[PDB]
Amino acid sequence: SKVTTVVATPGQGPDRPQEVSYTDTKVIGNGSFGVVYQAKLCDSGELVAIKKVLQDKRFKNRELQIMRKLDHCNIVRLRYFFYSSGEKKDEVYLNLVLDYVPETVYRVARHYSRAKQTLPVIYVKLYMYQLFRSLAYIHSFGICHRDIKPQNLLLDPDTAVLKLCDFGSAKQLVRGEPNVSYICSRYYRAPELIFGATDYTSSIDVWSAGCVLAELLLGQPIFPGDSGVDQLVEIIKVLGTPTREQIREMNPNYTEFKFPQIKAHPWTKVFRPRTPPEAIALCSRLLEYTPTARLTPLEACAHSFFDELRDPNVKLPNGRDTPALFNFTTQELSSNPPLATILIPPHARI
Amino acid sequence: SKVTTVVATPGQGPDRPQEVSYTDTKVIGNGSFGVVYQAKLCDSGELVAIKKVLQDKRFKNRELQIMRKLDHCNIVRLRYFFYSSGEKKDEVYLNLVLDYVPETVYRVARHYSRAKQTLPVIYVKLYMYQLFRSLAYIHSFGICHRDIKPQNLLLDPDTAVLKLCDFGSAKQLVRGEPNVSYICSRYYRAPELIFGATDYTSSIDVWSAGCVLAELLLGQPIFPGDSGVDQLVEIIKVLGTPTREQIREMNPNYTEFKFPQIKAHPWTKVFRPRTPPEAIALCSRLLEYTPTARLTPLEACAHSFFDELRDPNVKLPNGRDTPALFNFTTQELSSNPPLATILIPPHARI
Ligand SMILES: CN1CCN(S(=O)(=O)c2ccc(-c3cnc(N)c(C(=O)Nc4cnccc4CN4CCCC4)c3)cc2)CC1
Ligand SMILES: CN1CCN(S(=O)(=O)c2ccc(-c3cnc(N)c(C(=O)Nc4cnccc4CN4CCCC4)c3)cc2)CC1
Numbered sequence: 033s034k035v036t037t038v039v040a041t042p043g044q045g046p047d048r049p050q051e052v053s054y055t056d057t058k059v060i061g062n063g064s065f066g067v068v069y070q071a072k073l074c075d076s077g078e079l080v081a082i083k084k085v086l087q088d089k090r091f092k093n094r095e096l097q098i099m100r101k102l103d104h105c106n107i108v109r110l111r112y113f114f115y116s117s118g119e120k121k122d123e124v125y126l127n128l129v130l131d132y133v134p135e136t137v138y139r140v141a142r143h144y145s146r147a148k149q150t151l152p153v154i155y156v157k158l159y160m161y162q163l164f165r166s167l168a169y170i171h172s173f174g175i176c177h178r179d180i181k182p183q184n185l186l187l188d189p190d191t192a193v194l195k196l197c198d199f200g201s202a203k204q205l206v207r208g209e210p211n212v213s214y215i216c217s218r219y220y221r222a223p224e225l226i227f228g229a230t231d232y233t234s235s236i237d238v239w240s241a242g243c244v245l246a247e248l249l250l251g252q253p254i255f256p257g258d259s260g261v262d263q264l265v266e267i268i269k270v271l272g273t274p275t276r277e278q279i280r281e282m283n284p285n286y287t288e289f290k291f292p293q294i295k296a297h298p299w300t301k302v303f304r305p306r307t308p309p310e311a312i313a314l315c316s317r318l319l320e321y322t323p324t325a326r327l328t329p330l331e332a333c334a335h336s337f338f339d340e341l342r343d344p345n346v347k348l349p350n351g352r353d354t355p356a357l358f359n360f361t362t363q364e365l366s367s368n369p370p371l372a373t374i375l376i377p378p379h380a381r382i
Numbered sequence: 383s384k385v386t387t388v389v390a391t392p393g394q395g396p397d398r399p400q401e402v403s404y405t406d407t408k409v410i411g412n413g414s415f416g417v418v419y420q421a422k423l424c425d426s427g428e429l430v431a432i433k434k435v436l437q438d439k440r441f442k443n444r445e446l447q448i449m450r451k452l453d454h455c456n457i458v459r460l461r462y463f464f465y466s467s468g469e470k471k472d473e474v475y476l477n478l479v480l481d482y483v484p485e486t487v488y489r490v491a492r493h494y495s496r497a498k499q500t501l502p503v504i505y506v507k508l509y510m511y512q513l514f515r516s517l518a519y520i521h522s523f524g525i526c527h528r529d530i531k532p533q534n535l536l537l538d539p540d541t542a543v544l545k546l547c548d549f550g551s552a553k554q555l556v557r558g559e560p561n562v563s564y565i566c567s568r569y570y571r572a573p574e575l576i577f578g579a580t581d582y583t584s585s586i587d588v589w590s591a592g593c594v595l596a597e598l599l600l601g602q603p604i605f606p607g608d609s610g611v612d613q614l615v616e617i618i619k620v621l622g623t624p625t626r627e628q629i630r631e632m633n634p635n636y637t638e639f640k641f642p643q644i645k646a647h648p649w650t651k652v653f654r655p656r657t658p659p660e661a662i663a664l665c666s667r668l669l670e671y672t673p674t675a676r677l678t679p680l681e682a683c684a685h686s687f688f689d690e691l692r693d694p695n696v697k698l699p700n701g702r703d704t705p706a707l708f709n710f711t712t713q714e715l716s717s718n719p720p721l722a723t724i725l726i727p728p729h730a731r732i
Contacts, residue, residue, distance in 0.1 A: 063612075064607055064609075064611075064612035064615050064616070088642060088643065090643060179609065181608075201609070201611060210635070210638075212610075212611070212636070212639060213578050213610075214576050214577065214578070214609065214610025214611055214613075214614065215609060215610065215611050216609055217608040217609045218568055218608050218609075226564050227564065228563050228564070228578030228580075230578075230635065257414055258531075258567040258568050259529065259551070259564065259565060259566055259567045259568075260562075260563075260564025260565070261414070261551060261562070261564055261565050262413070262414040263564075264564065265414045266414070285560070285580065286562070289562060290441075292438060293438070293440065
């Protein structure tokens with residue numbers, strides 16, 4: 033087959049470019065970002081994804097700057113990066129060589145939905161725990177993903193490994209600095225964002241993760257609607273009408289605007305009867321109006337819902353062992369070090 | 383079949399309730415609002431739509447108050463309204479008995495898209511002109527629809543009549559008064575809305591109409607994306623980067639965040655080669671960053687693109703005559719009475 037050779041800089045470590053050869057290049061994604069390709073490394077035979085985006089030279093690429101700083105088992109690793117041409121003549125493309133993860137939470141959730149089945153609760157715990165670990169990690173550097181949604185959550189169906197992807201909307205949130213409210217995808221946007229808040233925190237990713245949990249439990253999005261108004265109506269139908277205080281906590285420019293006085297709906301009636309109570313309690317705690325009232329990713333990891341993952345007898349339905357779940361770093365635990373008493377179970381490999 | 387009898391108040395004219403009997407009640411829509419039913423009037427045999435919404439009781443329904451004031455050939459008529467119940471006790475339901483229009487621009491656009499065809503240009507002129515007439519009308523009372531999109535544009539395929547529907551998001555915009563920016567559906571939202579502006583005018587409906595025109599010409603949305611950021615990237619790719627003046631016109635809290643410096647793309651390269659130049663010129667003039675730079679609905683009606691509609695020999699493909707197009711009222715022309723020199727052609731003056 034056609035072999036492409038490039039002089040790529042490694043993602044982590046010293047800036048020491050290497051000749052990287054790859055083959056079997058197929059397009060696997062096309063979006064607002066640019067193009068995502070799948071390719072096989074000639075050396076290892078290992079599969080990779082290459083994200084190709086047009087570079088301005090006007091500034092450094094924000095995604096690359098973020099990607100270069102990260103190393104987590106639940107985040108798609110930046111292996112290399114290089115520059116090229118490809119669609120535009122006289123223009124530069126930045127190419128991010130990333131880990132390849134075969135499936136998306138989006139496609140898997142769709143399979144079950146179509147077959148009128150729900151994703152087994154063991155997978156809901158595995159996928160959600162791993163998402164919270166990735167969130168604890170990025171948040172520990174002050175980095176907010178800002179686009180948490182099923183399409184950005186990659187899975188290995190055989191290993192049960194989830195890896196967060198898309199660092200295109202990612203930004204380091206500094207207190208007092210204003211940020212664009214128009215980030216985040218429909219169904220997954222926190223109420224502060226819908227209200228156009230520019231003072232939001234990393235707790236927007238927690239709201240999004242909570243929407244993803246509720247969707248895997250329901251078999252459909254919890255807060256649908258093609259407009260902010262429709263989305264808010266669906267939120268109010270579950271959470272009840274936000275208080276004047278709760279409105280202030282999100283955006284204080286929307287306090288004088290009248291809302292439909294809906295009763296605070298019991299979260300147990302939202303989900304099917306068989307739904308575990310700890311799953312319901314987790315949603316309740318993530319999907320909160322007051323951004324500060326939401327659990328943190330590290331606290332979410334330590335929630336009762338994930339206890340089965342900490343059981344020494346836990347196994348994957350295919351017989352295999354669970355992937356890495358307890359290899360926490362000092363950085364990863366930094367937000368609340370005592371949580372490691374819950375997080376690292378006695379049996380955890382050492 | 384099951385016959386339902388109600389004492390309904392007529393939508394327009396004096397408050398003189400009447401016994402309205404209807405049968406063959408089927409659900410035709412389910413959304414954030416409530417339910418839309420189709421029903422047959424026992425009297426005439428005439429088909430109607432009944433919109434059932436849960437009433438707040440604390441205050442009058444804004445959609446009902448808006449509907450009661452309107453009478454236009456390009457707007458779904460409120461025939462009657464009555465109160466009832468459905469879920470279950472204490473809960474009052476407002477029922478709007480409306481004209482039934484058999485198709486949606488959404489479904490029709492979808493048929494052509496699926497068949498790799500485009501809606502014939504004669505229909506693009508007929509449907510778009512009629513939308514602008516409905517917009518000229520509501521705007522003349524200071525009323526902004528705020529949710530212009532293909533799903534809210536109803537059609538009679540035999541008569542080529544378009545009728546605007548959904549007055550759920552409609553509001554009378556008063557200068558100096560702030561309005562929610564979270565109205566309007568993805569793909570159809572004006573840049574001021576994406577930027578969280580609360581000071582927007584009725585020209586948001588013009589942007590939406592312009593998105594609908596470009597979509598009927600392209601065979602797909604002009605500015606897709608599941609996030610405001612993705613939508614804005616698509617807008618910038620066509621319109622070029624907005625100036626700091628243009629950013630100020632939309633939202634002056636976003637004049638500080640800098641954007642990807644993309645050249646002002648020629649609108650001719652956006653559409654297929656066959657696309658009439660006046661259609662391209664119309665999108666160009668509707669899809670403008672500066673809200674004040676956009677054509678008004680009445681000016682849009684008077685645009686070169688619609689000249690074939692003013693031809694005395696114009697006929698529908700089935701042989702029939704074009705629906706009413708020139709019966710302008712003083713109210714309808716109020717924004718710019720001299721435009722009637724272009725709008726009312728000589729053959730309509732006889
Ligand atoms: C042969 N098949 C395998 C299965 N798919 S799939 O649609 O399930 C799919 C598509 C892409 C990936 C993928 C694998 N590894 C990655 N590192 C990325 C990735 O980084 N994607 C990405 C980058 N930037 C922004 C967004 C994304 C999200 N993806 C874009 C394509 C779909 C998800 C994406 C995985 C499965 C298509 C091709
Ligand atoms: C047998 N088929 C006929 C064609 N359809 S359809 O989906 O094309 C359809 C659905 C509804 C209408 C319809 C006909 N007349 C109306 N007056 C309204 C209406 O008022 N709809 C409405 C009310 N409030 C908010 C939004 C809407 C928008 N519609 C609701 C369904 C989608 C369009 C809706 C027309 C065609 C379904 C049943």
